Point group: D2
Chain length 473, copies 4
């Protein structure tokens, strides 16, 4: 009955690319928990257990953004819907394929806008196997954006052995969708590119002056520091993805005289104060920038880069901007960088990190302090899972403010049977607070140490024994 | 202020290609702005009393020629009465813009209702250059959601303006321009495996499947000329099926699409894919085709198509009394390329299918989203009006092409108030409604309604005629709008269909 | 399996006072209908069948407000929830006990019954679950514990009940009580709206009562007299919505407003309200000079209306309302369409005592008035029928405009197998509807009535009274043609004469 | 505009009895400090919104007043989710104050609240500021009424959105005055039929039932002199059950209430009634009694009660190891009139029920709405603050607040100890952590991290240590054994 379906659902999820499931102990109990246990011991799926339902949601988000695969989270409680809320909101705005599994019972008496779909299974053979597997492929497709190009969370409810397809394939195969919507842009108009979360890669814009957020993959080689923007007057703005970070960016995007062209990978598009003139997925370009425009942009960029480096050296104290500058100087191709969505991602932008070669993650969907520790842990687990399937696991470095670390300190309560990352290092920046991070870390039995900003590079260079936290005052 | 907001919203909707607005009067500034645009000739106002039939009138105005259409509400039972039309517009993917006028402080003083059905539910700001951009941006975003400019999933949008001319772009341009989106998802299909195409509502055109035997619902656009009658399907052994669009009509289709042992390939124009098969093997938007169908497979399917058609026509002629199936056959024979055919969503659309209508050259419409009784008269009127609008716009001085609707008496009676049109409101010039009047578990337990009295009540020309007169009567143009009633028998219906079955 | 579930659920509904159920032919559902069919054959319930789902909702509205009972509508289709929407909204704002059998915000409860489990082992404890939930539905719908009746949504996807037919979970109707201190020597007017209670200790005060409000006393104050007076203080009963002078006064920030309601909800106009309760604990008595002023302005309002109607040659809708008012008798039920008829009856001065006045004042929509009148007449006749009393059923008289008639003309589509009222008479005041606001139109009402085989007659206003005194011809429609051109100047002539 | 809008709603809230506000951090924010600086409200600041919601719940249950949480973020409302569920089921008047922007959201829960009210976008209206005063204060008076149950008798959480000083009434009165509402629904009950009273969360007080044997959850206000231990109930067969409030605690209660043979009478303070019994025969708010209980019934219940009490007491003494039940019993024996007791909602509340606590003169709090582990630390802090604050207004030593919570619950909500140095801090809150291990978490280190006084003590020191106040907030950790708990419970049941 509900045992046979549970095993078909799990098998179909695995065939759809689910490698990780996060589970919470329940007031009742997890839809298909035994079938998940079975798949874990088999090596087919990796299970993760957490007491806190909220940090469980962010652990799954991390497991999704670390290598780009869909992830399941099995609710089990009367508190569960409400605790996963923040993670579902983040998964919606950041377009993260989070599958929320649950169970409600038909035999007993009885997320809305944020999810891409709400699918309920038939309660309860050969034909029924086909109805269970199609439903699960539909869950996966909506979650991964396979048809919509708009990934996001999905609520999948199971009301509480038979073969799938030959050769391990999804019951219902849905190939890669190409979403495409070309836009004429003339590049001899003085243009700046603003790159935000979820931006695509555009080789025909690679030469333009580009203000790129740390999570935005860069198409080229001509960066423009954000603090250089108020010193320039673009006639035209190309906006990739959804940029939120800086005030001169918002000011420029809300200037009625400056045409903004929005280029996205999915069907959503943003505005600031309704001044977007046109949408697309890519540009068909004519012209080339004025050399005088490029020179001026380049000069204002050196000028801004210089004024940050000077005022950092000018300051005796170690601010959070010094910490960001030292982390950036220490990263190397192949690293994953996970940034807290508040000050870390802003400080890394100002310190001028060159992100090419680096996999940068941040919960930019709602930019909440919430959940950064579990997100970093989940990203590291999934990223190291990807490397294992190809020498030593590549580093994951996380930058987190001290309030954010203590807020999500529950992410550190990991039982000894649960998967732990090999190469995660969390750098905490201690900028009215009073908490002792070192006591916090020993309470949860996590190697921790205070260090000066000068020594972060060398300390980061030496592989640590597992999960560690570096506190910087 | 609210007057500025309403004149901006209207101007932006016109740049989006809204040509027709349906207005339900109540209580306000939006109403005058539409009055200005209509008097200017920039749009076409339609005023209706009943909010429900107004939504179905908008459906018809939208599917008549493919444009986005607005329904403006100014009332409290307003959104609730547009429910049925919003559901229809959801499942049939119709760009319907529901403009509401919410009064927030008054609902508090007593002491997104549509929810999942709409593509978007966007509140405008309660009523200088900054607010112009906020208002026109919100409106271009309403328009794109409704037409599927970026999603390829058109449908209904809730647009709420609460209540207590700054220009748009040069050259009549939409504020935020959204160019053509192509959504692409090829599937590899081998045509040497014995294949039939099932084509439903919303199906795209596929020239590389033109040769295959195709069971096409009346509203599906055909890609070829190798039709396969739906009653022929159970007499054949296809090894795989290509599903276009969202088919719902026939039991042989549903029984075949539930055939666990037959692979189904689902091709659609947008992101949704139908549930009807649990053995769907692959979903996509177009086929990449290896090979070709065997000539012996084509000949067998062509032969069985001819056989099912002949059995239907033979049993019709041997059956002593006029049924709705006879009426549908007679309508089908009377149509000609350029005609628009509007079909009631219950028996008429099935009966036209059984009668074997050849739909190439004909624009066939039917509310196949939920296939309700409601609104068929208003849908046919709006479809006639928009389709005539496009032909007027072509320059040809010729009489507008015909719109012919086929609806049952119960549906006609139930939406008869769709005929209540003010003297100053747009009337179709070449709309003919054929009413197949066959009178019709505790509910099962029967009308006796006088259809000609009903038309007299709304001052619509109406004539009772026999099935053999229908063709010649339809050939003769009449009043702009008219109703032709054909009496029919429902008791012998079971007997006719059993005869058709046994004759195969 | 299911059969047992539907039979107990129907049985509990009948125990809970449900006498009428409305049903639509639909694509799905039979057992729910079978259990209802049995109960209809045996005379326990009366089933009504309708094809238009919107019509069915308003028919059930009428069956509920005619004699105060909960009523079920049983949905059966994919268009059903969406068509039942307008009636659920009306039921919500007018606090009508409408049970919807298979909305979110609009309903008092959304209950799902257990999918029936096929084990006769547990049929005695799982009887009790089914009846409890049914009693939970009835209590939410009738306001048994909340004092806030409204629509409920009840999902169903021979073991007995309590002895003596008692409902399973007995909830004695509640007393909700919240006394408010009010000094009646301050010059007070009472504004009585929809859903108002009866207050004996306020009976002497000048009272502007909407036609659906029960009169507490014998001191009426015409709404047109209100702008000619300065109340120092207002007592607002229920939820008044009718007149702009009332909205102006209720809005006035200088005038304290005391809201007295029968349920937990309370209204405001412009957040003006100083206090809320359910009853007045009064000190004092109205100053005689205040009662004199109010009575004198009441007379001038009444005189201005009747005189200017007589000096007006063309028959308006206000003439029709006046004639219907003059023909009413104690024991009649009056049903008013929600726009002009209820306003015009208030203007013409109806004394409502002895009269049961119904109107869909929750959202005041044009929709559903024909079926609401039909439903109200059926439930009212059926109550009087259960007194055993040998006199023939009392008249129901509905007054509606032309537009409302065509808008709900589908309500006249009644099979010969269905309950039809014995003494219902629908007066249509036909005003023929500028292009948007005026809504000009021509409908032949008599052609429409003939299409549905309903007796109809177009008559003059003067014949209305005599024609109304006639015996019951079953169900009839009486049309009186009316002119809206002269309406603007008749109203102005009343004000100037005021 | 926005600025004066914020100032007036803050002022109406204060008129309607709001004394504490919890702020997660614009004009609404600034309206609160001036009222906090003026001493009109006491403002509390928190960084974690889930934590802020549970602190507010504690502030509301500590003394029965309405409490606002003011929030300004997008993750804001979602993070307040679990506290809103608790406030719904426990009927806690929590006003969720929300401030955010529609255009900004465009340019990128509902069933739990008693009301969702969006206030008007501030319009300057220099000449309409009078009618804008009235529309904002009225709406704030609706929010307070819906929250406190002033007309419904059904208190709960309210969503009050303000999107993005003109005087109130004379003499500090609220804009719309709602007097006391009594909801009354008499029920005829004959007490000569053998009756047990089961009193749950939210139970009222009924003098005419005082002589009946009564199984009372720890949070149930007691009205009688005749308790019946919960372990005694399986050993009896009542002929009638009177169910007070919403009982959730014990499996023998569920089994008896689901027993098809036993008529159940439901008496509640509000219009809701529990569905625990499918055989609920009737529901009301008070009983009108005929008769009186038969002496033989009263004798049998008193004897069963004595056996249960003796079984617990004697098997605790004979047990060679400290368990959570020894800790619960030691906390019970150390309580005195005036104390406030806060219980974590899994084991502590059950263990205090079996230890057989006498709740007379004791105010007992527990998040019995959904009985989750979330926010127990913050609820206790909030209950202590509000309880202490109601003692200062009486004009009289701050009374003790003692909290008993398991170690996993303490770990989970330990970040509720993160309290800024300007923020209000309890005078006399002692958290007793009963640590049977559940993780490997050092609880003492956790208290270090938040700079909270902490000691590990043995169970027989707890009574002594509890009158040694020291810091305003302290944590007392009692190590306990979980390995022998099944045997202790079996020894108790076997001795019944």
């Amino acid at each position: 009955p509900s045992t046979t379906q549970a095993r078909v659902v799990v098998d179909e999820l695995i065939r759809g690319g689910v490698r990780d499931v996060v589970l919470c102990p329940g007031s009742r109990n997890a839809p298909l928990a035994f079938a998940l246990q079975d798949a874990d011991r088999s090596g087919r799926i990796r299970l993760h257990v957490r007491i806190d339902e909220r940090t469980a949601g962010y652990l799954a988000i991390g497991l999704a953004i670390g290598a780009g695969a869909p992830v399941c989270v099995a609710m089990t409680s009367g508190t569960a819907v409400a605790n996963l809320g923040p993670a579902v909101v983040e998964a919606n705005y950041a377009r993260v394929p989070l599958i929320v599994l649950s169970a409600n019972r038909p035999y007993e008496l009885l997320f809305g806008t944020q999810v891409r779909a709400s699918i309920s299974l038939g309660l309860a053979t050969s034909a029924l196997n086909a109805t269970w597997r199609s439903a699960t492929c539909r869950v996966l497709a909506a979650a991964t954006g396979a048809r919509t190009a708009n990934a996001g969370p999905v609520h999948f409810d199971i009301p509480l052995t038979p073969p799938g397809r030959p050769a391990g394939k999804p019951w219902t195969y849905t190939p890669p969708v190409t979403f495409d919507q070309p836009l004429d842009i003339d590049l001899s108009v003085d243009t700046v590119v603003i790159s935000g979360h979820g931006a695509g890669v555009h080789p025909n814009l690679a030469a333009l002056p580009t203000v790129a957020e740390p999570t935005a993959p860069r198409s080229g080689d001509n960066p423009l520091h954000p603090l250089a923007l108020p010193l320039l007057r673009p006639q035209q703005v190309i906006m990739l993805g959804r940029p939120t970070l800086h005030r001169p960016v918002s000011v420029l995007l809300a200037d009625a005289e400056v045409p903004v062209f929005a280029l996205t990978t999915g069907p959503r598009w943003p505005d600031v104060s309704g001044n977007s003139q046109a949408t697309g997925t890519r540009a068909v370009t004519t012209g080339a920038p004025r050399p005088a425009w490029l020179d001026r942009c380049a000069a204002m960029n050196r000028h801004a880069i210089a004024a940050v480096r000077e005022q950092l050296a000018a300051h005796p104290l170690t601010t959070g901007l010094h910490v960001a500058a030292a982390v950036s100087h220490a990263l190397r191709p192949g690293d994953q960088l996970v940034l807290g969505a508040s000050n870390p991602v802003r400080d890394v932008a100002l310190a001028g990190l060159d992100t090419r070669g680096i996999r940068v993650r941040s919960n930019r969907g709602v930019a909440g302090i919430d959940g950064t520790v579990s997100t970093a842990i989940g990203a590291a687990l999934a990223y190291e899972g990807a490397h294992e399937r190809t020498d030593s696991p590549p580093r994951t470095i996380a930058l987190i403010g001290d309030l954010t670390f203590v807020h999500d300190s529950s992410g550190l309560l990991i039982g000894p049977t649960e998967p732990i990352p090999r190469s995660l290092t969390i750098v905490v920046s201690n900028d009215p607070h009073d908490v002792d991070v070192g006591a916090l870390c020993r309470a949860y039995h996590v190697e921790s140490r205070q260090i000066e900003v000068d020594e972060l590079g060398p300390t980061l260079d030496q592989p640590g024994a597992g999960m560690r936290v570096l506190e910087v005052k």
